[PDB]
């Protein structure tokens, strides 16, 4: 059964010349992809947004979900703090930069609307111990310099 | 104070957690070492041990430094 297409490019929720998925109802522009695809370089066959790719890749199984996210966070064991944020963009959908409302609550001199417009009103451990001991040697020499500063003021 | 060791709640209700930050997580004395129970590895233990002893070393040394320099300005004050 063919669904209906949403006439708004949810990246900025504005209409124009756009194309939509075969299983997803919402549409997007040509240049709003990553990589941004040309108006004429249309993909061969059926193209989906991040969502339906996610769906047919996951096999609607939470087991596969946590499996590939686990071996993913194990892949990025060097940036492990950012791994959970990193895994989301490879399946999330792009949308224009809109800072949340929590920021602009400080100045009434700005006006916005639904337009989105603005108006004016291992060797790793060795290197870490390297840095540790060089800084501690620095600070112990500078602390005997501290007490010697006190002594030189005592030379008054 | 008292225990840092839980009981063994088996029946396959013992759930594990692998924290996304390695060099600061505290969480209990209730770890499990991998190559609620926290899953931790030898590298994080190495780093935490070295960090604790280094910073305790330098803190106690600066405390003795400040105490002794205060002593010298108090004694020359006489």
């Amino acid at each position: 059964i063919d669904f209906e297409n949403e006439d708004f490019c949810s990246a900025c929720n504005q209409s124009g010349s756009f194309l939509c998925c075969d299983t997803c109802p919402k549409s997007f522009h040509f240049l709003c992809l990553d990589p941004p695809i040309d108006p004429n370089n249309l993909p061969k066959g059926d193209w989906h947004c991040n969502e339906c790719k996610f769906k047919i890749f996951i096999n609607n199984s939470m087991a596969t979900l946590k499996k590939i996210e686990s071996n993913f966070i194990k892949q990025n064991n060097n940036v492990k703090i950012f791994a959970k944020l990193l895994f989301n963009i490879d399946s999330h959908n792009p949308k224009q930069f809109q800072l949340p409302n929590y920021i602009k609550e400080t100045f009434p001199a700005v006006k916005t609307g639904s337009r989105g417009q603005y108006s004016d009103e291992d060797e790793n451990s060795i290197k870490y111990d390297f840095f540790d001991k060089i800084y501690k040697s620095k600070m112990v020499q500078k602390r005997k310099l501290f007490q010697f500063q006190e002594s030189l003021i005592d030379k008054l | 104070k008292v225990w840092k060791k839980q009981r063994l709640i088996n029946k396959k209700n013992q759930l594990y957690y692998e924290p996304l930050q390695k060099i600061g997580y505290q969480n209990n004395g209730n770890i499990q070492i991998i190559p609620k129970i926290t899953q931790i590895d030898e590298n994080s233990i190495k780093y935490d041990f070295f960090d604790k002893i280094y910073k305790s070393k330098m803190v106690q040394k600066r405390k003795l430094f400040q105490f002794q320099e205060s002593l010298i300005d108090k004694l020359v004050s006489n």
Binding site: - | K4, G29, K46, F49
Partner: peptide, 30 residues
């Protein structure tokens, strides 16, 4: 530089894996 050698020396001298695990658990508790 030498602390890597310390941890490797401990891993060698303990000889076993369960004993080294208990050693790491002691170190974590501290």
């Amino acid at each position: 530089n030498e602390e890597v050698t310390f941890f490797e020396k401990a891993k060698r001298y303990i000889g076993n894996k369960h004993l080294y695990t208990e050693f790491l658990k002691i170190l974590n508790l501290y």
